[PDB]
Amino acid sequence: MIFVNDVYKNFGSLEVLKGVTLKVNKGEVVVIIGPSGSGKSTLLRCINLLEEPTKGEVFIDGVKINNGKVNINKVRQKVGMVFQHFNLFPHLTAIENITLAPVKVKKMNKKEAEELAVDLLAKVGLLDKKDQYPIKLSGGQKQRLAIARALAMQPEVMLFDEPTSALDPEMVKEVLNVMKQLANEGMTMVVVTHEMGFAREVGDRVIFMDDGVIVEEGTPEEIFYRAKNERTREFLSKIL
Protein backbone atom coordinates (compact mmCIF):
# COMPACT_ATOMS: atom_id res chain seq x y z
CA MET A 1 0.00 0.00 0.00
CA ILE A 2 2.60 2.63 0.94
CA PHE A 3 6.26 2.04 0.26
CA VAL A 4 8.77 4.87 0.62
CA ASN A 5 12.10 3.38 -0.42
CA ASP A 6 15.41 4.90 0.69
CA VAL A 7 14.56 8.48 -0.17
CA TYR A 8 16.64 11.62 0.13
CA LYS A 9 15.38 15.16 -0.15
CA ASN A 10 17.32 18.41 -0.36
CA PHE A 11 16.15 21.96 -0.51
CA GLY A 12 19.31 23.57 -1.89
CA SER A 13 22.25 22.96 0.42
CA LEU A 14 19.78 21.94 3.13
CA GLU A 15 19.72 18.13 3.34
CA VAL A 16 16.37 17.18 4.90
CA LEU A 17 15.87 13.41 4.30
CA LYS A 18 19.03 11.28 4.28
CA GLY A 19 17.88 7.81 3.30
CA VAL A 20 14.48 7.04 4.75
CA THR A 21 12.36 3.92 4.34
CA LEU A 22 8.71 3.54 5.38
CA LYS A 23 6.18 0.74 4.71
CA VAL A 24 2.56 1.00 5.78
CA ASN A 25 -0.25 -1.53 5.25
CA LYS A 26 -4.03 -1.33 5.40
CA GLY A 27 -5.40 -0.49 8.83
CA GLU A 28 -2.15 0.61 10.51
CA VAL A 29 -1.96 3.87 12.36
CA VAL A 30 1.68 5.02 12.01
CA VAL A 31 2.83 8.04 14.03
CA ILE A 32 5.98 10.06 13.29
CA ILE A 33 7.60 12.14 16.03
CA GLY A 34 10.93 13.87 16.51
CA PRO A 35 12.66 17.22 16.99
CA SER A 36 11.89 20.14 14.72
CA GLY A 37 13.42 20.11 11.25
CA SER A 38 14.12 16.37 11.44
CA GLY A 39 12.19 15.85 8.20
CA LYS A 40 8.88 14.36 9.41
CA SER A 41 6.59 16.51 7.27
CA THR A 42 8.85 16.12 4.22
CA LEU A 43 8.64 12.32 4.45
CA LEU A 44 4.88 12.55 4.91
CA ARG A 45 4.64 14.81 1.89
CA CYS A 46 6.63 12.46 -0.34
CA ILE A 47 3.88 9.87 0.05
CA ASN A 48 1.39 11.85 -2.04
CA LEU A 49 4.14 13.54 -4.06
CA LEU A 50 3.61 17.08 -2.73
CA GLU A 51 7.39 16.81 -2.39
CA GLU A 52 9.54 14.98 -4.89
CA PRO A 53 12.43 12.87 -3.61
CA THR A 54 15.89 13.75 -4.84
CA LYS A 55 16.64 10.02 -4.90
CA GLY A 56 14.76 6.93 -3.83
CA GLU A 57 11.27 6.00 -4.91
CA VAL A 58 7.75 6.04 -3.57
CA PHE A 59 5.26 3.31 -4.51
CA ILE A 60 1.57 3.34 -3.86
CA ASP A 61 -0.36 0.09 -4.09
CA GLY A 62 2.81 -1.32 -5.68
CA VAL A 63 3.15 1.25 -8.49
CA LYS A 64 6.02 3.77 -8.58
CA ILE A 65 4.65 7.30 -8.56
CA ASN A 66 7.80 9.40 -8.86
CA ASN A 67 9.02 8.11 -12.24
CA GLY A 68 6.82 10.39 -14.33
CA LYS A 69 5.10 7.27 -15.72
CA VAL A 70 1.76 7.56 -13.86
CA ASN A 71 -1.34 9.76 -13.49
CA ILE A 72 -0.59 11.62 -10.26
CA ASN A 73 -4.17 12.86 -9.89
CA LYS A 74 -5.60 9.34 -9.60
CA VAL A 75 -2.90 8.64 -7.06
CA ARG A 76 -3.75 11.67 -4.90
CA GLN A 77 -7.39 10.65 -5.14
CA LYS A 78 -6.50 7.60 -3.04
CA VAL A 79 -4.09 9.34 -0.67
CA GLY A 80 -5.72 12.06 1.42
CA MET A 81 -3.85 14.88 3.18
CA VAL A 82 -4.81 17.07 6.12
CA PHE A 83 -2.76 20.23 6.51
CA GLN A 84 -1.33 22.03 9.51
CA HIS A 85 -2.81 25.32 8.24
CA PHE A 86 -6.19 23.94 7.12
CA ASN A 87 -6.04 25.13 3.47
CA LEU A 88 -9.82 25.52 3.35
CA PHE A 89 -11.20 27.22 0.18
CA PRO A 90 -12.29 30.67 1.51
CA HIS A 91 -14.72 31.51 -1.32
CA LEU A 92 -16.62 28.24 -0.81
CA THR A 93 -19.22 27.40 1.81
CA ALA A 94 -18.75 24.36 4.15
CA ILE A 95 -20.73 21.93 1.97
CA GLU A 96 -19.16 23.42 -1.14
CA ASN A 97 -15.69 22.81 0.25
CA ILE A 98 -16.76 19.22 0.80
CA THR A 99 -18.54 18.54 -2.53
CA LEU A 100 -16.21 20.41 -4.90
CA ALA A 101 -13.85 17.50 -5.65
CA PRO A 102 -16.33 14.62 -5.72
CA VAL A 103 -18.41 16.57 -8.25
CA LYS A 104 -15.46 17.75 -10.33
CA VAL A 105 -13.05 14.82 -9.93
CA LYS A 106 -15.33 11.80 -9.56
CA LYS A 107 -18.22 13.35 -11.48
CA MET A 108 -20.62 12.41 -8.68
CA ASN A 109 -24.23 13.44 -9.06
CA LYS A 110 -24.85 16.63 -7.12
CA LYS A 111 -27.67 15.43 -4.89
CA GLU A 112 -25.50 12.48 -3.96
CA ALA A 113 -22.54 14.75 -3.24
CA GLU A 114 -24.75 16.93 -1.06
CA GLU A 115 -25.88 13.85 0.89
CA LEU A 116 -22.33 12.50 1.33
CA ALA A 117 -21.38 15.93 2.56
CA VAL A 118 -24.21 16.25 5.07
CA ASP A 119 -23.29 12.86 6.41
CA LEU A 120 -19.65 13.93 6.85
CA LEU A 121 -20.64 17.29 8.40
CA ALA A 122 -22.91 15.42 10.79
CA LYS A 123 -20.09 13.04 11.67
CA VAL A 124 -17.54 15.74 12.55
CA GLY A 125 -20.21 17.82 14.30
CA LEU A 126 -20.49 20.72 11.82
CA LEU A 127 -23.98 20.20 10.30
CA ASP A 128 -25.30 23.56 11.49
CA LYS A 129 -22.35 25.20 9.75
CA LYS A 130 -22.97 23.72 6.32
CA ASP A 131 -23.69 27.10 4.72
CA GLN A 132 -21.07 29.07 6.65
CA TYR A 133 -17.84 30.22 5.10
CA PRO A 134 -14.50 29.18 6.45
CA ILE A 135 -13.80 32.61 7.85
CA LYS A 136 -16.59 32.18 10.35
CA LEU A 137 -15.19 29.04 11.85
CA SER A 138 -12.86 28.50 14.75
CA GLY A 139 -9.59 26.60 14.27
CA GLY A 140 -11.13 23.40 15.54
CA GLN A 141 -14.13 23.83 13.26
CA LYS A 142 -11.83 24.55 10.31
CA GLN A 143 -9.77 21.40 10.81
CA ARG A 144 -12.88 19.26 11.32
CA LEU A 145 -14.28 20.66 8.06
CA ALA A 146 -11.00 19.95 6.26
CA ILE A 147 -11.12 16.36 7.56
CA ALA A 148 -14.70 15.98 6.29
CA ARG A 149 -13.55 17.37 2.93
CA ALA A 150 -10.73 14.85 2.62
CA LEU A 151 -13.07 11.98 3.67
CA ALA A 152 -15.51 12.94 0.89
CA MET A 153 -13.10 11.52 -1.73
CA GLN A 154 -13.10 8.31 0.29
CA PRO A 155 -9.32 7.77 0.27
CA GLU A 156 -7.72 4.51 1.36
CA VAL A 157 -5.14 6.24 3.52
CA MET A 158 -5.23 9.62 5.28
CA LEU A 159 -2.11 11.67 5.78
CA PHE A 160 -2.11 14.19 8.63
CA ASP A 161 0.63 16.78 8.65
CA GLU A 162 0.59 18.06 12.25
CA PRO A 163 -3.16 18.78 12.12
CA THR A 164 -3.46 20.40 15.56
CA SER A 165 -0.19 22.35 15.83
CA ALA A 166 -1.74 25.65 14.73
CA LEU A 167 -4.71 25.17 17.04
CA ASP A 168 -5.25 26.91 20.38
CA PRO A 169 -4.93 24.50 23.36
CA GLU A 170 -8.72 24.49 24.08
CA MET A 171 -9.18 23.34 20.52
CA VAL A 172 -6.82 20.39 20.20
CA LYS A 173 -8.93 17.56 21.75
CA GLU A 174 -11.87 17.95 19.42
CA VAL A 175 -9.63 17.40 16.41
CA LEU A 176 -7.64 14.56 18.00
CA ASN A 177 -10.90 12.82 18.94
CA VAL A 178 -12.08 12.89 15.33
CA MET A 179 -8.72 11.46 14.35
CA LYS A 180 -9.12 8.71 16.99
CA GLN A 181 -12.57 7.87 15.79
CA LEU A 182 -11.13 7.33 12.29
CA ALA A 183 -8.46 5.10 13.75
CA ASN A 184 -11.14 3.14 15.57
CA GLU A 185 -12.95 2.63 12.28
CA GLY A 186 -9.96 0.98 10.66
CA MET A 187 -8.81 3.95 8.53
CA THR A 188 -5.17 3.65 7.49
CA MET A 189 -3.35 6.71 8.82
CA VAL A 190 0.05 8.31 8.84
CA VAL A 191 0.19 11.12 11.38
CA VAL A 192 3.00 13.55 12.07
CA THR A 193 2.31 15.07 15.49
CA HIS A 194 3.70 16.84 18.52
CA GLU A 195 0.85 15.43 20.59
CA MET A 196 2.39 12.37 22.25
CA GLY A 197 -0.89 11.45 23.88
CA PHE A 198 -2.32 10.63 20.44
CA ALA A 199 0.66 8.43 19.57
CA ARG A 200 0.32 6.59 22.90
CA GLU A 201 -3.45 6.14 22.64
CA VAL A 202 -3.99 5.15 19.00
CA GLY A 203 -0.70 4.66 17.23
CA ASP A 204 -0.10 1.08 16.20
CA ARG A 205 3.43 2.05 15.36
CA VAL A 206 5.57 5.04 16.35
CA ILE A 207 8.50 6.27 14.27
CA PHE A 208 11.23 8.40 15.84
CA MET A 209 13.11 10.62 13.38
CA ASP A 210 16.24 12.67 13.93
CA ASP A 211 18.50 14.59 11.53
CA GLY A 212 16.78 13.30 8.39
CA VAL A 213 16.82 9.67 9.35
CA ILE A 214 14.55 7.19 11.15
CA VAL A 215 16.63 6.34 14.22
CA GLU A 216 14.18 4.07 16.06
CA GLU A 217 10.66 2.66 15.65
CA GLY A 218 8.33 0.27 17.39
CA THR A 219 4.97 0.08 19.14
CA PRO A 220 3.89 3.03 21.30
CA GLU A 221 4.81 1.20 24.51
CA GLU A 222 8.27 0.34 23.14
CA ILE A 223 9.11 3.94 22.21
CA PHE A 224 7.53 5.68 25.21
CA TYR A 225 8.52 3.20 27.96
CA ARG A 226 11.41 1.07 26.72
CA ALA A 227 13.27 3.06 24.05
CA LYS A 228 16.56 1.39 23.21
CA ASN A 229 18.23 4.38 21.58
CA GLU A 230 19.87 7.33 23.31
CA ARG A 231 18.55 10.08 21.03
CA THR A 232 15.02 8.76 21.47
CA ARG A 233 15.30 8.85 25.28
CA GLU A 234 16.78 12.34 25.12
CA PHE A 235 14.07 13.80 22.90
CA LEU A 236 11.41 12.19 25.08
CA SER A 237 13.01 13.46 28.25
CA LYS A 238 12.84 17.04 26.92
CA ILE A 239 9.27 16.65 25.67
CA LEU A 240 7.36 14.59 28.25
Binding site: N48, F83, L100, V105
Partner: protein, 214 residues
Protein backbone atom coordinates in the same frame (compact mmCIF):
# COMPACT_ATOMS: atom_id res chain seq x y z
CA UNK B 1 2.52 90.11 -15.95
CA UNK B 2 1.36 89.24 -12.43
CA UNK B 3 -0.93 86.30 -11.65
CA UNK B 4 -4.58 86.56 -12.78
CA UNK B 5 -6.74 83.49 -12.16
CA UNK B 6 -10.07 85.18 -12.84
CA UNK B 7 -9.01 85.78 -16.46
CA UNK B 8 -8.77 82.01 -16.61
CA UNK B 9 -12.46 81.41 -15.84
CA UNK B 10 -13.77 81.99 -19.40
CA UNK B 11 -11.52 79.15 -20.56
CA UNK B 12 -13.40 76.59 -18.46
CA UNK B 13 -14.74 74.72 -21.52
CA UNK B 14 -11.16 74.07 -22.70
CA UNK B 15 -10.13 72.56 -19.39
CA UNK B 16 -13.31 70.44 -19.41
CA UNK B 17 -12.69 69.37 -23.02
CA UNK B 18 -9.12 68.49 -22.11
CA UNK B 19 -10.22 66.62 -18.97
CA UNK B 20 -12.77 64.61 -20.95
CA UNK B 21 -10.04 63.79 -23.43
CA UNK B 22 -7.62 62.51 -20.79
CA UNK B 23 -10.41 60.22 -19.49
CA UNK B 24 -11.33 58.86 -22.93
CA UNK B 25 -7.63 58.43 -23.72
CA UNK B 26 -6.92 56.65 -20.45
CA UNK B 27 -10.06 54.45 -20.26
CA UNK B 28 -9.49 53.22 -23.81
CA UNK B 29 -5.74 52.71 -23.30
CA UNK B 30 -6.05 50.77 -20.02
CA UNK B 31 -9.02 48.81 -21.36
CA UNK B 32 -6.98 47.65 -24.33
CA UNK B 33 -3.89 47.22 -22.12
CA UNK B 34 -5.83 44.83 -19.90
CA UNK B 35 -7.16 42.61 -22.70
CA UNK B 36 -3.74 42.64 -24.29
CA UNK B 37 -2.16 42.14 -20.87
CA UNK B 38 -4.26 39.08 -20.05
CA UNK B 39 -3.22 37.56 -23.38
CA UNK B 40 0.49 38.24 -22.78
CA UNK B 41 0.35 36.65 -19.33
CA UNK B 42 -1.30 33.53 -20.75
CA UNK B 43 1.61 33.24 -23.20
CA UNK B 44 4.18 33.44 -20.41
CA UNK B 45 2.36 30.54 -18.77
CA UNK B 46 2.66 28.47 -21.96
CA UNK B 47 4.88 25.40 -21.76
CA UNK B 48 6.03 26.04 -25.32
CA UNK B 49 9.40 27.70 -24.58
CA UNK B 50 9.52 30.13 -27.55
CA UNK B 51 6.19 31.73 -26.62
CA UNK B 52 7.03 32.17 -22.93
CA UNK B 53 10.33 33.65 -24.13
CA UNK B 54 8.57 36.14 -26.40
CA UNK B 55 6.11 37.23 -23.71
CA UNK B 56 8.94 37.57 -21.19
CA UNK B 57 11.01 39.65 -23.61
CA UNK B 58 8.04 41.85 -24.49
CA UNK B 59 7.25 42.53 -20.82
CA UNK B 60 10.88 43.17 -19.88
CA UNK B 61 11.57 45.52 -22.79
CA UNK B 62 8.45 47.59 -22.33
CA UNK B 63 8.76 47.95 -18.55
CA UNK B 64 12.49 48.62 -18.64
CA UNK B 65 12.11 51.38 -21.21
CA UNK B 66 10.52 54.90 -21.16
CA UNK B 67 6.89 55.39 -22.22
CA UNK B 68 7.96 58.59 -24.05
CA UNK B 69 10.41 56.73 -26.26
CA UNK B 70 7.66 54.24 -27.13
CA UNK B 71 5.24 57.05 -28.02
CA UNK B 72 7.78 58.81 -30.25
CA UNK B 73 8.87 55.48 -31.73
CA UNK B 74 5.29 54.97 -32.89
CA UNK B 75 4.51 58.55 -33.94
CA UNK B 76 7.79 59.90 -35.30
CA UNK B 77 9.63 56.66 -36.00
CA UNK B 78 6.88 55.35 -38.26
CA UNK B 79 6.53 58.41 -40.50
CA UNK B 80 9.50 57.41 -42.65
CA UNK B 81 7.56 54.29 -43.67
CA UNK B 82 4.87 56.43 -45.22
CA UNK B 83 2.82 56.38 -42.06
CA UNK B 84 0.78 59.27 -40.73
CA UNK B 85 -1.07 57.98 -37.69
CA UNK B 86 -2.94 60.70 -35.73
CA UNK B 87 -1.78 61.86 -32.31
CA UNK B 88 -4.73 60.00 -30.80
CA UNK B 89 -4.15 56.52 -32.23
CA UNK B 90 -0.44 56.97 -31.51
CA UNK B 91 -1.16 57.81 -27.87
CA UNK B 92 -3.75 55.08 -27.36
CA UNK B 93 -1.41 52.52 -28.94
CA UNK B 94 1.60 53.56 -26.87
CA UNK B 95 -0.32 53.70 -23.61
CA UNK B 96 -2.16 50.41 -24.30
CA UNK B 97 1.16 48.70 -25.03
CA UNK B 98 2.96 50.06 -21.95
CA UNK B 99 -0.08 49.23 -19.84
CA UNK B 100 -0.27 45.74 -21.35
CA UNK B 101 3.19 44.86 -20.05
CA UNK B 102 2.49 46.24 -16.58
CA UNK B 103 -0.85 44.45 -16.43
CA UNK B 104 0.74 41.12 -17.46
CA UNK B 105 2.99 41.50 -14.42
CA UNK B 106 0.03 42.42 -12.21
CA UNK B 107 -1.78 39.24 -13.26
CA UNK B 108 1.23 36.98 -12.71
CA UNK B 109 1.65 38.51 -9.28
CA UNK B 110 -2.00 38.26 -8.30
CA UNK B 111 -1.83 34.56 -8.99
CA UNK B 112 1.48 34.16 -7.16
CA UNK B 113 -0.15 35.89 -4.17
CA UNK B 114 -2.71 33.25 -3.39
CA UNK B 115 -1.37 31.04 -0.59
CA UNK B 116 0.23 27.91 -2.11
CA UNK B 117 -1.76 25.88 0.41
CA UNK B 118 -4.86 26.38 -1.73
CA UNK B 119 -3.24 24.68 -4.69
CA UNK B 120 -1.77 21.96 -2.53
CA UNK B 121 -5.19 21.14 -1.09
CA UNK B 122 -6.86 21.22 -4.48
CA UNK B 123 -4.34 18.77 -5.95
CA UNK B 124 -4.34 16.63 -2.81
CA UNK B 125 -8.05 16.07 -3.36
CA UNK B 126 -7.36 14.70 -6.82
CA UNK B 127 -8.02 17.88 -8.84
CA UNK B 128 -5.82 18.50 -11.89
CA UNK B 129 -3.93 21.77 -12.34
CA UNK B 130 -6.72 22.93 -14.70
CA UNK B 131 -9.47 22.21 -12.15
CA UNK B 132 -7.46 23.73 -9.29
CA UNK B 133 -6.95 26.83 -11.42
CA UNK B 134 -10.57 27.20 -12.54
CA UNK B 135 -12.36 26.39 -9.27
CA UNK B 136 -9.90 27.41 -6.55
CA UNK B 137 -6.94 29.55 -7.60
CA UNK B 138 -8.24 31.91 -10.30
CA UNK B 139 -11.28 33.08 -8.29
CA UNK B 140 -8.85 34.20 -5.57
CA UNK B 141 -6.20 35.60 -7.93
CA UNK B 142 -8.86 37.86 -9.43
CA UNK B 143 -9.56 39.43 -6.05
CA UNK B 144 -5.85 40.14 -5.86
CA UNK B 145 -5.70 41.60 -9.35
CA UNK B 146 -8.71 43.95 -9.52
CA UNK B 147 -7.36 46.43 -6.95
CA UNK B 148 -4.02 46.58 -8.74
CA UNK B 149 -5.76 47.12 -12.10
CA UNK B 150 -7.70 49.87 -10.41
CA UNK B 151 -4.38 51.35 -9.34
CA UNK B 152 -2.94 50.90 -12.83
CA UNK B 153 -5.67 53.16 -14.24
CA UNK B 154 -4.93 55.87 -11.67
CA UNK B 155 -1.24 55.81 -12.61
CA UNK B 156 -2.08 55.95 -16.32
CA UNK B 157 -4.08 59.14 -15.82
CA UNK B 158 -0.88 60.91 -14.85
CA UNK B 159 1.01 59.01 -17.53
CA UNK B 160 -1.40 60.14 -20.26
CA UNK B 161 -0.36 63.78 -19.83
CA UNK B 162 2.56 62.76 -22.00
CA UNK B 163 0.55 62.65 -25.23
CA UNK B 164 0.35 66.40 -24.89
CA UNK B 165 3.88 66.65 -26.27
CA UNK B 166 2.64 64.89 -29.40
CA UNK B 167 0.01 67.58 -29.85
CA UNK B 168 -2.99 65.62 -28.57
CA UNK B 169 -5.64 67.83 -27.01
CA UNK B 170 -5.47 66.25 -23.53
CA UNK B 171 -5.76 68.08 -20.22
CA UNK B 172 -2.10 69.11 -20.30
CA UNK B 173 -2.14 70.46 -23.88
CA UNK B 174 -4.72 73.10 -22.92
CA UNK B 175 -2.06 75.20 -21.19
CA UNK B 176 -0.40 75.79 -24.54
CA UNK B 177 -3.69 76.73 -26.18
CA UNK B 178 -4.72 79.15 -23.47
CA UNK B 179 -1.30 80.83 -23.31
CA UNK B 180 -1.30 81.39 -27.08
CA UNK B 181 -4.22 83.72 -26.36
CA UNK B 182 -3.19 84.93 -22.89
CA UNK B 183 0.61 84.78 -22.72
CA UNK B 184 0.10 83.09 -19.32
CA UNK B 185 1.60 79.65 -18.67
CA UNK B 186 1.64 79.55 -14.84
CA UNK B 187 -2.08 79.88 -14.07
CA UNK B 188 -3.41 77.33 -16.58
CA UNK B 189 -0.70 74.92 -15.38
CA UNK B 190 -1.70 75.35 -11.73
CA UNK B 191 -5.32 74.78 -12.72
CA UNK B 192 -4.34 71.67 -14.66
CA UNK B 193 -2.37 70.30 -11.69
CA UNK B 194 -5.40 70.92 -9.46
CA UNK B 195 -7.57 68.92 -11.86
CA UNK B 196 -5.13 65.96 -12.05
CA UNK B 197 -4.95 66.03 -8.27
CA UNK B 198 -8.71 66.02 -7.76
CA UNK B 199 -9.05 63.19 -10.29
CA UNK B 200 -6.38 61.19 -8.47
CA UNK B 201 -8.00 61.75 -5.06
CA UNK B 202 -11.47 60.89 -6.35
CA UNK B 203 -10.40 57.64 -7.94
CA UNK B 204 -8.20 56.74 -4.95
CA UNK B 205 -11.16 57.09 -2.59
CA UNK B 206 -13.40 55.13 -4.87
CA UNK B 207 -10.99 52.28 -5.44
CA UNK B 208 -9.95 52.13 -1.84
CA UNK B 209 -13.54 51.91 -0.93
CA UNK B 210 -14.08 49.11 -3.38
CA UNK B 211 -10.98 47.54 -2.00
CA UNK B 212 -12.35 47.86 1.49
CA UNK B 213 -15.29 45.90 0.11
CA UNK B 214 -13.12 42.88 -0.75
Amino acid sequence: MTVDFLSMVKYTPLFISGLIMTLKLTFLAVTIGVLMGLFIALMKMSSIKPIKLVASSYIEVIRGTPLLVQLLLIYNGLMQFGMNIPAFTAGVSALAINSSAYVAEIIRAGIQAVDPGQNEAARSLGMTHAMAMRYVIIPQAIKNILPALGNEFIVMLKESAIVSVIGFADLTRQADIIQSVTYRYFEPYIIIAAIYFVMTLTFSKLLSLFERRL
